[PDB]
Amino acid sequence: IVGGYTCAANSIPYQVSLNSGSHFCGGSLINSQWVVSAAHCYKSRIQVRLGEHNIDVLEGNEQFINAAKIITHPNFNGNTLDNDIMLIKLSSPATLNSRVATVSLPRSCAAAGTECLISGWGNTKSSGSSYPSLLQCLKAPVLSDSSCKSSYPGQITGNMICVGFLEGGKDSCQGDSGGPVVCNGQLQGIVSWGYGCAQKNKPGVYTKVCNYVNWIQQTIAAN
Amino acid sequence: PDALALA
Ligand SMILES: [Ca+2]
Numbered sequence: 001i002v003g004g005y006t007c008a009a010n011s012i013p014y015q016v017s018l019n020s021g022s023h024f025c026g027g028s029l030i031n032s033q034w035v036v037s038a039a040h041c042y043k044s045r046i047q048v049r050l051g052e053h054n055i056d057v058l059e060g061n062e063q064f065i066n067a068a069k070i071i072t073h074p075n076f077n078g079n080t081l082d083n084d085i086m087l088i089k090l091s092s093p094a095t096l097n098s099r100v101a102t103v104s105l106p107r108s109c110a111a112a113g114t115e116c117l118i119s120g121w122g123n124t125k126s127s128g129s130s131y132p133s134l135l136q137c138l139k140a141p142v143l144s145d146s147s148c149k150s151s152y153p154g155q156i157t158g159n160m161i162c163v164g165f166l167e168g169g170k171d172s173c174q175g176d177s178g179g180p181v182v183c184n185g186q187l188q189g190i191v192s193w194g195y196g197c198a199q200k201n202k203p204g205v206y207t208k209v210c211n212y213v214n215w216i217q218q219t220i221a222a223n
Numbered sequence: 224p225d226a227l228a229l230a
Binding site: 045047058062064065066067068091 | 224228
């Protein structure tokens with residue numbers, strides 16, 4: 001996250017870290033047994049780390065559970081990043097408490113201008129690399145279709161929304177991928193792609209979760 | 224660090 005702030009410890013209880021020797025992507029807990037992330041974060045073996053704040057130190061509230069099943073969307077397109085969504089089933093249920101909780105799925109898509117909260121442990125520098133140990137937060141609005149499509153001509157599908165600032169300086173970056181965008185208590189976006197990070201006129205592009213509730217539900221019921 | 228595999 002570029003141009004964010006350090007989140008209060010355990011103030012984003014649905015945030016998870018996907019680990020394969022080290023942190024590589026974020027995710028969101030939507031059920032005690034299921035985590036939603038981005039398909040381009042796919043890896044064969046994944047350990048899901050809940051209850052994290054400082055990923056470099058054991059604090060005592062963590063629950064590390066390995067992924068039992070990893071299901072990428074059947075229509076994910078690696079070229080366009082359409083349908084950039086993946087579901088991970090935990091080998092054992094997470095225990096829900098003050099530090100580990102689920103985030104609601106959207107009841108409807110969000111209005112333009114809706115204030116959201118984005119979080120992750122991705123790169124924090126606009127020039128160079130710097131991965132934080134402490135979870136970062138960023139408040140950003142959902143941009144209209146117009147501003148989103150004018151920013152990326154012919155590259156925005158109906159399964160994508162832009163969230164951020166056209167002036168740059170504030171955005172999600174590498175390492176935040178798969179992470180949550182929560183607006184009014186509902187998971188509206190998944191960190192997906194963009195042209196770089198925090199560049200002017202190039203806001204982050206996110207998977208539009210409100211189109212996938214049926215797929216999520218059907219998949220969880222089937223597995 | 225802490226918790227293991229299998230799987
Ligand atoms: Ca920790």
